[PDB]
Design a protein around this ligand. Sequence first.
Ligand code: BO2
Ligand code: BO2
Ligand code: BO2
Ligand code: BO2
Ligand code: BO2
Ligand code: BO2
Lengths: 219, 180, 179, 181, 180, 181, 181
Amino acid sequence: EGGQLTEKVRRKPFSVVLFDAIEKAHQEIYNSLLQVLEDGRLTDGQGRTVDFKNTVLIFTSNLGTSDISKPVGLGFSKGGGENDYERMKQKVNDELKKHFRPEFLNRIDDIIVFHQLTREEIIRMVDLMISRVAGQLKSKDMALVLTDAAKALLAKRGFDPVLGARPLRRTIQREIEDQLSEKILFEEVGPGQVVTVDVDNWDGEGPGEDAVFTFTGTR
Amino acid sequence: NPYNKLFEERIIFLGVQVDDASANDIMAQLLVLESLDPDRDITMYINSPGGGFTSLMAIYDTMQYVRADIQTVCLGQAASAAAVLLAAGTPGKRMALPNARVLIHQPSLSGVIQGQFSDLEIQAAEIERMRTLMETTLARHTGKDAGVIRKDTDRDKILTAEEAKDYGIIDTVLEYRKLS
Amino acid sequence: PYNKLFEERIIFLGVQVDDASANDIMAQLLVLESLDPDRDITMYINSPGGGFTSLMAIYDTMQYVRADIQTVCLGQAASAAAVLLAAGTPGKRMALPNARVLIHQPSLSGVIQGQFSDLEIQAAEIERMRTLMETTLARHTGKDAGVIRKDTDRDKILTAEEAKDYGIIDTVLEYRKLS
Amino acid sequence: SNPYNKLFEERIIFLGVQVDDASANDIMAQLLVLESLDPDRDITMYINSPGGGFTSLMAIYDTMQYVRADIQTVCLGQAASAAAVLLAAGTPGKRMALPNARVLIHQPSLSGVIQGQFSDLEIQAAEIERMRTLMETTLARHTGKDAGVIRKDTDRDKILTAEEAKDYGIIDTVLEYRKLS
Amino acid sequence: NPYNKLFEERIIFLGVQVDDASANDIMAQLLVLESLDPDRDITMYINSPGGGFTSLMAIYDTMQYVRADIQTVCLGQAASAAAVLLAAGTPGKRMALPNARVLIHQPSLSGVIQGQFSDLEIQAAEIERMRTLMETTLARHTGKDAGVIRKDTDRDKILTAEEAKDYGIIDTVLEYRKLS
Amino acid sequence: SNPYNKLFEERIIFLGVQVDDASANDIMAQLLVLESLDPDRDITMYINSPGGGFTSLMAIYDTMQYVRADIQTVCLGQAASAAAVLLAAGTPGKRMALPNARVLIHQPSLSGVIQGQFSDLEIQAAEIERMRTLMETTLARHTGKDAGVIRKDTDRDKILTAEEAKDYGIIDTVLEYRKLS
Amino acid sequence: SNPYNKLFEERIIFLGVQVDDASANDIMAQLLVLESLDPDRDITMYINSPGGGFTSLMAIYDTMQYVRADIQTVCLGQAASAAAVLLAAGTPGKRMALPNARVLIHQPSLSGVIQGQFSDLEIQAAEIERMRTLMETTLARHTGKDAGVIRKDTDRDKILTAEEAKDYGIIDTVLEYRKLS
Ligand SMILES: CC(C)C[C@H](NC(=O)[C@H](Cc1ccccc1)NC(=O)c1cnccn1)B(O)O
Ligand SMILES: CC(C)C[C@H](NC(=O)[C@H](Cc1ccccc1)NC(=O)c1cnccn1)B(O)O
Ligand SMILES: CC(C)C[C@H](NC(=O)[C@H](Cc1ccccc1)NC(=O)c1cnccn1)B(O)O
Ligand SMILES: CC(C)C[C@H](NC(=O)[C@H](Cc1ccccc1)NC(=O)c1cnccn1)B(O)O
Ligand SMILES: CC(C)C[C@H](NC(=O)[C@H](Cc1ccccc1)NC(=O)c1cnccn1)B(O)O
Ligand SMILES: CC(C)C[C@H](NC(=O)[C@H](Cc1ccccc1)NC(=O)c1cnccn1)B(O)O
């Protein structure tokens, strides 16, 4: 066997190769991948050079945020909201230079430090994650409407400014799905139209942690 | 050290005369504990005789700057600057032990500073700026009117902990966990 | 040898009660509360006392902790240290047989100057310090505070056998070997 | 590790004490090490100093101007005499101060009397005017003032609150608290 | 240290002026060696000029408290407070080197203590209580009658080791292991 | 590690303090260790000293002339008396100074009065003229002056700015900042 | 490791300070350890001392004469009385000095007045003449002089330059620099 990476790229030369959690590799596995970046070569153990010249090599790192994420920085400083992203970029790009040899980072075409998800983007993540839930209820002869007051309540309770959209995935799981999964098993919301309106309405503003979703099916 | 065990559980410790040496230590301690846990409360133990106004406002601004709420605890004495730092904790916090001695009084000059009357007009405009700032600071932390603070800190105002709670310096007098 | 004493939960007063010594003992009392809150802290007292806010810093902390405080007077408990000696738990508070317990009213070390309005307050405080020293030494000795005021009018040196009769200590500590 | 070592690990030098030959030599050692560690990441300078010392000032001043790292000066409770010049000596767009910091600018002095012949004292006075003019020239290109305004203002002790040291040009922003408390 | 090797072989070491610093060290040393071996004898080396009565009776009571017998050894000097600690060892023990200088004398006040005559009536009733206790302590350890101790410690009574054995301060004058 | 230890690891000795018997003995120990580590790599000498001491001067002076490593002297805020001679004592093509450094050259003095018979004082004065002539001879082959010019200039305190200590020959270049700031 | 520890590792004892009971006891401990480490490899002695102390002199003197290792004395900036005797006390064919070292020989003195009866002072003067004669006898078999020449020359302070301490016999060679600089 020629290795997991060298075969999958030799079968599909035009690929996107994701090296997920790249800082969790040993530091001597980057040195195998140095000439993948610069020459498009990775000669396998059998000796066949594999073409990486048509791949999109994506490395994914949490370096410089596997801690700095926590708000506030050691000491005094101006601004927050867009200077904590410049604090993010300086922290991340220094953790990359600390962790990687400078000839690895020299060979990367673009290092993109990612933004924390803003409150307006977590609202649009709700549209994207209910669509996974509603897409599963299509297979059950159901539909899932999610009212716009219920989009806002998921968006507040799912917004962590330092994790983003994975806490929202938990809130949609805890509040929509885990409540909707028993309603399917009660057969109280079988093949119909689950509307999911908010009730306490959380006044649409302020905290809404006394508010609750209600699931009713019609048609 | 036992102090290192206190700092590991996020307790800064004033302890000594508030001067440039002591203020610089506490600000270093406040910012490290902000960096370790910015959401977990820093506790501040105060057994200080006070003194020093810029050393006060160095500690004061830093414990107001940090994201962590400051739980000030007066041990035996919170005199002068120490009493302003005692009121400088978070509301719903600011304990004091039942026989603590809170002492508020107006700023002074330790010893005479000489000079021309134009030099002394400025050293007196500063000691009134220091006095007004000490009364403005001790007004939004005690709920008083600053003019009441000026009338009360006209002399030494020694407060027992039970009447530093009525004054607004502290919020609760700290009950003992065992009677003993 | 002090670290071996602190490992077996013995804080050690030893020196002049001041802001340096009170801050050490309060750090020692709270660490031993965190290590074992149910096992008794022992306090060895060989101090000449002094300092009232340093007294009431140590006093409140040894009253605050959940661990009962076993005070032991070594050779001397004077001024602030005799109040800390009485500040231990009842059924505890030992003293060695030739210990010297010295209770007396608070003083000002040296003269503090000022206007008579400044000195009216420094005297209302030294009477508040005196009344607090007599109130503290009344619920720990069982006396009536007015008896404490009449007795601490001057230096009242107590032998350990008559500091037990006074209520400062509860037992005079018998030797384990005759020698 | 000391809490100061944790500050220096996150690239915060700390003035703290009286600016003298001992304190200036420490800060210059701290400024050059942090230039060697990261020359592109900003050194932060915390200032709680009563100042004093002009050659110790200009030793710290030239070093924090020499290093490639931008200096973020932060006044803690006090920047007096030489320390207020070091506070203005930070990078523009930086130079914070806490809201109750006390910036004190005044002309150079001689601590105590220095004796000598009048030819010796003509030179010790030409130097204290060279020290004065340099202190006003330095505090002019960092505050945007005209040196003659600095000379009229540092004629006596000029105590600046942080909100009016920002209007003076000593600092650029008064440092808002992260929590209200 | 060479002192640590002595303490490892259970030798506490007086050495210095008996004060609050020195008494607190020796009591810490006496109790650790009681905890290590309560049945093996603690040896006490005394080269002290004495001084301090409550520091004396702090050391005295502790070396009487511990279960381990105390072997006191006078090195060059046991002068008041330290001569009482020298007699405070166990009978059948209490050595002294042949040119040791045992000095017993009544308690004194180092310097004048001022006060009202009611204050000084008590500071004198205490220095007589200190004197009587010093003579009572040095009577059950020397076999004398306290009144003989009072007549002998009226002034400085310097004892050679050969006549501190006749006095009852020590029990044997310590013979050299090599003649040299 | 101290920040001074990081400087010494990169071969920077540091004068810093009053040139006395304690400070001269440290620097000579530092100069000889760095000669033994790399005899061909340049020792850098940072000078923020008020000077003083002539035999402590000539102890440092002879050692930094003895070692095979070229000495790069850098004046930080001050090179006074014994320290300005050590500043000129670096290698030609070297001897930097920061732009607001204060080079102070003056003739040797006696700190306080030394008593004695006039035969004792004839010798303590023949020595202070031997110290003066040696200070002017040393500061002549390192500045290119004629010693008699050094004697006329160090008659009093001659404070040199770094830009005019370069014209004097004390230093060879005024040290440009790496960042404008 | 200190820079002094690196010098002592390469068998360089270091006088450095005022010759007193503290400094003599250190050097004798250093001389005997280096005799025990290598008795055949030369101990080097660096001397920057102002001297003082005659029994502290003769404690160092006898120990550096006792050890089997030859002593290479090197004068750094100063060898005053006591230290100049220790400088001459090195081995012949050794005893360097740096070119601007200041060798100062003079007769023993009493620092301050010692009181007493005239029978007490007859003995304190017979001792200071025994100290003087011993200082001149010691400095005669190490310089090749006649002691009476040493007595006439150390009548007052005799400051020797290193080039004329070689002509005097205190040192044997004036130490050439390894780099010109
Ligand atoms: C909180 C206020 C009342 C401060 C109190 N103490 C002061 O006023 C202190 C005492 C002091 C210390 C040094 C020099 C002059 C004066 N005031 C100052 O710090 C001070 C400093 N410079 C000028 C004017 N006042 B207190 O003792 O902390
Ligand atoms: C148990 C109580 C009485 C403690 C007593 N302590 C005192 O008398 C001490 C003596 C002292 C020390 C420093 C400055 C002024 C006075 N009292 C005080 O601590 C004190 C402090 N400030 C004002 C008034 N008294 B002890 O001496 O009897
Ligand atoms: C920002 C500038 C003005 C720094 C000022 N520093 C001084 O006034 C200090 C005070 C001082 C210290 C020691 C010896 C003599 C004088 N000025 C000097 O450092 C100094 C040193 N030598 C000659 C003249 N001035 B500060 O006090 O305003
Ligand atoms: C065995 C007895 C006599 C001890 C002797 N020591 C003393 O006399 C010492 C000398 C002294 C020391 C401090 C303050 C006042 C007096 N006595 C005391 O310790 C003392 C202390 N307070 C009141 C009265 N005496 B002896 O000189 O060592
Ligand atoms: C050394 C040259 C550069 C000129 C200056 N030297 C001095 O003034 C110093 C000041 C001083 C120090 C100690 C004892 C007496 C005098 N001169 C000497 O080092 C000195 C030492 N012994 C005798 C004569 N002069 B400068 O360093 O202060
Ligand atoms: C001449 C040589 C031997 C040394 C020179 N002078 C001495 O001999 C020294 C000078 C001195 C130093 C300190 C204290 C008292 C006296 N002589 C003595 O040490 C000395 C000691 N006791 C009695 C008499 N002279 B020089 O000062 O070291």
